[PDB]
């Protein structure tokens, strides 16, 4: 079998991860004590992908939780599934870093990481075929970005041939919930780009819109938001955990989604998301699903794909459905809206099918889009970045941590070039 290491970093990362593991355990019949009470042999058969059968019937999700300070991971341990985790996988310091990327990637993180990695190594040692790593982190967070970035680099150093992917939480185009976002985010990306093999962009902003609209919710609690995200994450690796018709290994996804290194940012989506108040007025067909999947309004990343083109799209389906329906339906999309796809690439769609549906959803699908419209995000960031940077805003909170100002200019350089790259391909033509 192939194994995945799940690393969680930062308050956000840990909170998301907590929900993630809840979801995964649920799907495999694992209760809060780590005891197996599933119904299908499949649940157990390939459980190895995530859990390490410790002893008896106790399974221990191979996850590592990291934070610079307590009060977060603590709450995780106090929660429903706190006891499912092995204590020794909780690695944290006793200092904060109020969204101080420098601290997270230097003066504080440099100490903490000395541990962390040791645990990582141990976990990788227990694996038979290390599929890769998953990092749940939030951009802009002193830990999430600081440590996140650091760890990524350090891991590739020792596992250059493994697939690394992360589910980053990006900056919001609307109200920012931090002050020094631009800086932290930019600094992270500066290195992220040159490391992680693929990364997903999820924006709370977009998620709120979905909730208030599509889900008809009025109290979009972070727990609910995380739940939604978790669902997406689980979909991504369903192909590893369960049998299907067209299994798509994590690596495979990278191959059909990244055309050029560096250009590996994705917009995630998910269907169906019908509110309970209207579920009875649905059909739940392959067409219905694709309607949602390609609906700009269901993009979990706060960008409007309508203004860009897709370099490539992956569609992973779960449950039951015909091959005919899927393929034909996906074709129709490309044909009807050909202007939204990059002419350089014939067949801009990768599909996959697993025979195991989400609990309660006979049909479900995830959407991974590599749209050039993501450029927009980076553009926004760069603009905000230079606005602050040229005024030297708050730079003393980075300089004071031993950060060289030049690092910022380098970071910008990478960022701007990223934008340029997308812009070039955006309108580059075959002839």
């Amino acid at each position: 079998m192939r194994e995945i290491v799940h690393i969680q970093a930062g308050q956000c990362g840990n909170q998301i991860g907590a929900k993630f593991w809840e979801v995964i355990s649920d799907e495999h019949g694992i209760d809060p004590t780590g005891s197996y009470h599933g119904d299908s042999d499949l649940q157990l058969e390939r459980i190895n992908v995530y859990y390490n059968e410790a002893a008896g019937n106790k399974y221990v999700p191979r996850a590592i939780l990291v934070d610079l300070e307590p009060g977060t991971m603590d709450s995780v341990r106090s929660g429903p599934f706190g006891q499912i985790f092995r204590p020794d996988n909780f690695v944290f310091g006793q200092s904060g870093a109020g969204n101080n990327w420098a601290k997270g990637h230097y003066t504080e993180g440099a100490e903490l990481v000395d541990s962390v990695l040791d645990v990582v190594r141990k976990e990788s040692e227990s694996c038979d075929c290390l599929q890769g790593f998953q990092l749940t982190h939030s951009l802009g967070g002193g830990t999430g970005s600081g440590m996140g970035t650091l760890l990524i680099s350090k891991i590739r150093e020792e596992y250059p041939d493994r697939i690394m992917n992360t589910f980053s939480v990006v900056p919001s185009p609307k109200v920012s919930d931090t002050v020094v976002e631009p800086y932290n985010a930019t600094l992270s990306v500066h290195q992220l780009v040159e490391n992680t093999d693929e990364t997903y962009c999820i924006d709370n902003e977009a998620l709120y819109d979905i909730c208030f609209r599509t889900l008809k919710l009025t109290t979009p609690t972070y727990g609910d938001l995380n739940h939604l995200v978790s669902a997406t994450m689980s979909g991504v690796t369903t192909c590893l955990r369960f049998p299907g018709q067209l299994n798509a290994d994590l690596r495979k996804l990278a191959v059909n989604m990244v055309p050029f290194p560096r250009l590996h940012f994705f917009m995630p989506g998910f269907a169906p998301l019908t509110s309970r108040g209207s579920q009875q007025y649905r059909a739940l067909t392959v067409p219905e699903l694709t309607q949602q999947m390609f609906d700009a309004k269901n993009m979990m990343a706060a960008c409007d794909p309508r203004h860009g083109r897709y370099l490539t799209v992956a569609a992973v389906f779960r449950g039951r459905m015909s091959m005919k329906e899927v393929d034909e339906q996906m074709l129709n999309v490309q044909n009807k809206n050909s202007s939204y796809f990059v002419e350089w690439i014939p067949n801009n769609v990768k599909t996959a099918v697993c025979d195991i549906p989400p609990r309660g959803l006979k049909m479900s699908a995830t959407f991974i889009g590599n749209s050039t419209a993501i450029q927009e995000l980076f553009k926004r960031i760069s603009e905000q970045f230079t606005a602050m940077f040229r005024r030297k805003a708050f730079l003393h909170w980075y300089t004071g941590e031993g950060m060289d100002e030049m690092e910022f200019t380098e970071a910008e350089s990478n960022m701007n070039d990223l934008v340029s790259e997308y812009q070039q391909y955006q309108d580059a033509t075959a002839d």
Binding site: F260, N414, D417, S420, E421, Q424, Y425
Partner: protein, 128 residues
Amino acid sequence: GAAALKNYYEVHKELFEGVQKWEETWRLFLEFERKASDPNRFTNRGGNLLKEEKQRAKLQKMLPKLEEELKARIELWEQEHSKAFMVNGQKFMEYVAEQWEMHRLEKERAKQERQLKNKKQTETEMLY
């Protein structure tokens, strides 16, 4: 007269030097053939690959353009003057073809060399 000497001189600028221009273009072409071998360029931070492609196509067109021009210019010269248009023991158009084939055949050879090496590698593994 001097005017006639200057006339063929201008032809030579479009011919003799024209070949040199072909050779210069040819040289650059070879530089692209060389640069193409550096796999690091796949990390095209600046969109390099698109830039390269445009240039590759350009040169592919240029070399034919210049050759066709030279075919007419060399004719003009030899019609205007009995001396065969050759240098260093080879006709300038032969020289064009010479370097062309030099590259061609070498590239083909090198390919075949590696093909053989792969065949011998395969053999070795079967023997193993």
